[PDB]
Structures are given as C-alpha cells and as structure tokens.
Amino acid sequence: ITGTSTVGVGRGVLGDQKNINTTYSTYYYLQDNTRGDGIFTYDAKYRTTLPGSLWADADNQFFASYDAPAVDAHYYAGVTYDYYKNVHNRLSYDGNNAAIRSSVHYSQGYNNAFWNGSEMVYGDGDGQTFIPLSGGIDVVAHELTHAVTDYTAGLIYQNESGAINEAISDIFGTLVEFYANKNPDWEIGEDVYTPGISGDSLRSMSDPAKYGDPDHYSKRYTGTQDNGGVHINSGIINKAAYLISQGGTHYGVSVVGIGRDKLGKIFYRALTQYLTPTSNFSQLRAAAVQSATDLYGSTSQEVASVKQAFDAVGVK
Numbered sequence: 604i605t606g607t608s609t610v611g612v613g614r615g616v617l618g619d620q621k622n623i624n625t626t627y628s629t630y631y632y633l634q635d636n637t638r639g640d641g642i643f644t645y646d647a648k649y650r651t652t653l654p655g656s657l658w659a660d661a662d663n664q665f666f667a668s669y670d671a672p673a674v675d676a677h678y679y680a681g682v683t684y685d686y687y688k689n690v691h692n693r694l695s696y697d698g699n700n701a702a703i704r705s706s707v708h709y710s711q712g713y714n715n716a717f718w719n720g721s722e723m724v725y726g727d728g729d730g731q732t733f734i735p736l737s738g739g740i741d742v743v744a745h746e747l748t749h750a751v752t753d754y755t756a757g758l759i760y761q762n763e764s765g766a767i768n769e770a771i772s773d774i775f776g777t778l779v780e781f782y783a784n785k786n787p788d789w790e791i792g793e794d795v796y797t798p799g800i801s802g803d804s805l806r807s808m809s810d811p812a813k814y815g816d817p818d819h820y821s822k823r824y825t826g827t828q829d830n831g832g833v834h835i836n837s838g839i840i841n842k843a844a845y846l847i848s849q850g851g852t853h854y855g856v857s858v859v860g861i862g863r864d865k866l867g868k869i870f871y872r873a874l875t876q877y878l879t880p881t882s883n884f885s886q887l888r889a890a891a892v893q894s895a896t897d898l899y900g901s902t903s904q905e906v907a908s909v910k911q912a913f914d915a916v917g918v919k
C-alpha cells in the first residue's frame with residue numbers, strides 16, 4: 604500500500620513483546636518499508652486462497668492472540684532479511700531486494716509451513732503437533748531460504764538434490780537463529796513443536812538419528828515417500844554441516860570444527876557459485892571443498908574439516 608512508515612508493537616506466538624515496522628494509510632498494515640522493496644504479511648483467515656488480505660490493524664497494537672502469528676512472521680522475515688544482507692551481502696531472496704510476502708492463518712489446524720514458489724505460508728498448527736509455525740525463527744528462515752535456493756542453485760525438490768535443498772534450509776534456518784541469539788540450537792522447530800512435550804523438535808542437525816533420520820550415506824532412504832526422502836536424507840548433510848561448524852567424532856572419524864561463520868561462508872558460496880539443479884551429495888562435497896579452497900586455500904584447516912565431515916557421513 605502507499606502510506607507512511609511507522610512502528611507498531613505486539614506480542615509473538617511465545618508471548619514475547621516486539622516492535623514491528625508497519626505502514627499507515629487509514630489502517631496500519633503489516634508492511635515494512637525499511638527493508639528492500641518491502642516485507643508484507645497477509646491474513647489467510649483460515650482459508651487456503653493466497654496470499655489473502657494484507658494485514659490491517661486499527662491501532663498499530665498487535666497484542667491479540669489472533670495477531671501473534673502475524674507479528675512473528677513479519678518480525679522474523681525481517682531478521683532473516685538482515686541476516687542475508689549483513690552476513691552475505693545478499694539483498695532479499697533474489698539478490699535484488701524482491702518484496703517478501705508471508706501469509707499466516709493458512710487453513711484450519713494446519714501443521715506445515717512452506718514456500719509456494721512465490722511466498723511463505725504458515726499454518727496455525729493443530730495445537731498438539733504444532734502451535735502457529737511462524738513462532739519459530741528457524742522455521743521462518745528455513746522457508747525464506749527455500750526462496751534463496753530457488754533463485755540460486757535451483758536444486759530440484761526430489762531425491763538427493765531435494766535433500767540438499769532441505770539441508771540448506773535447515774542450515775541457514777539455524778544460522779539465522781544463532782544470528783538473532785535467542786535460545787539458539789542445532790535443532791529445527793523446537794519453539795513450535797509439540798507444546799505438550801518439552802525438549803523435542805522436528806529434526807536434529809547434531810544427531811539426526813534421534814528423530815529417525817540418517818546420519819550416514821549408508822543409511823540413506825531410497826524409497827519414494829517424501830519426494831524420495833528430502834526431509835529424511837537431509838539428515839546426512841545436516842550432520843556434515845554440524846560437524847564442520849562444531850566438530851566431533853562420528854563413526855570413528857574426527858572433524859575439527861571451524862565455527863558457524865565459516866560454515867555459513869562455505870555453504871553460501873557453494874549454494875550461489877557451484878551447486879546446480881541436479882547436484883547430488885557427492886557433488887555437494889565437491890562444491891563445498893572447492894568453496895573452502897576458494898576462501899581459505901587448498902591446504903587450510905577449513906578445507907581439511909570439510910573433507911573430514913563429508914568422510915564422516917560416508918559421502919565421497
């Protein structure tokens with residue numbers, strides 16, 4: 604909308620108060636003009652037609668329970684923008700400050716979030732498996748990273764390129780969580796999964812097997828469900844990325860950690876310069892080793908750790 608930029612206040616899904624950038628034109632809309640060509644958050648009103656209506660509020664105060672998913676989708680889209688701009692010099696998902704759009708209250712009791720090719724979409728959860736999914740910053744940043752991947756490597760969402768697509772979203776989702784520094788971890792979705800159960804998550808990067816995903820190529824899934832295991836086999840790559848950053852010994856193979864900033868640099872470079880739509884795991888290894896060689900030199904610790912990490916998860 605055309606209007607004047609202002610700053611509203613509200614509470615997110617977990618009850619935290621935060622300020623949000625809004626736009627005033629009769630109503631106050633969830634339109635942040637301070638980032639690129641805008642971040643825009645929409646109400647799908649429990650239906651499935653998208654994007655729905657640009658979120659409007661009469662008084663620029665967002666403290667209603669119905670407001671909470673919108674506040675977080677909006678706020679965390681901003682934090683993610685900031686991450687990509689400040690850490691990788693990338694402006695929005697297309698690198699040209701494309702408008703970021705999100706819709707919340709998608710469908711009824713809907714336990715998923717996704718990127719639909721044009722925007723982010725969040726269900727409210729059914730209250731048992733999930734609470735509103737924009738309440739997790741790693742969820743929001745995972746979805747916006749699907750947009751980054753689509754504009755860069757374009758990894759097809761099937762089989763090994765699909766599992767890499769998924770792991771890239773888990774990796775940068777987690778790096779954004781760490782950038783924002785509130786209760787960061789290498790788990791995915793913990794802030795919105797199973798409100799009845801503490802300490803679990805949808806996936807773990809540090810130990811994928813805890814939630815049934817493989818941590819070694821030899822345990823990869825080869826059937827056809829989940830588009831060929833894209834959310835499953837992503838555990839192999841998630842494990843490698845965890846080891847590259849934090850290090851460890853896995854099936855007897857030791858990895859020296861090099862930290863999250865260098866992890867992010869190496870995988871951002873592989874994502875934007877070397878991976879292609881049909882890259883497989885072995886090709887990812889090659890791209891990450893070359894990216895690290897580019898950045899730190901062929902005989903660096905960084906290169907050595909990338910190789911050790913891929914070795915530890917059985918990827919040659």
Ligand SMILES: Cc1cccc(C(=O)O)c1OC(=O)C1CC1
Pocket residue numbers: 714715716717718736741742743745746791792805
């Ligand atoms: C919750 C969910 C369901 C289906 C697909 C995705 C998807 O984005 O691939 C999804 O989100 C995630 O995987 C992580 C939690 C954000």
Ligand SMILES: [Ca+2]
Pocket residue numbers: 660661662663664665666
């Ligand atoms: Ca209000």
Ligand SMILES: [Ca+2]
Pocket residue numbers: 780785786787788793794
């Ligand atoms: Ca966390």
Ligand SMILES: [Ca+2]
Pocket residue numbers: 741777780787788789790791792793
């Ligand atoms: Ca997390």
Ligand SMILES: [Ca+2]
Pocket residue numbers: 793795796797798799800801802803804
């Ligand atoms: Ca839980």
Ligand SMILES: [Zn+2]
Pocket residue numbers: 745749769772
């Ligand atoms: Zn995903």
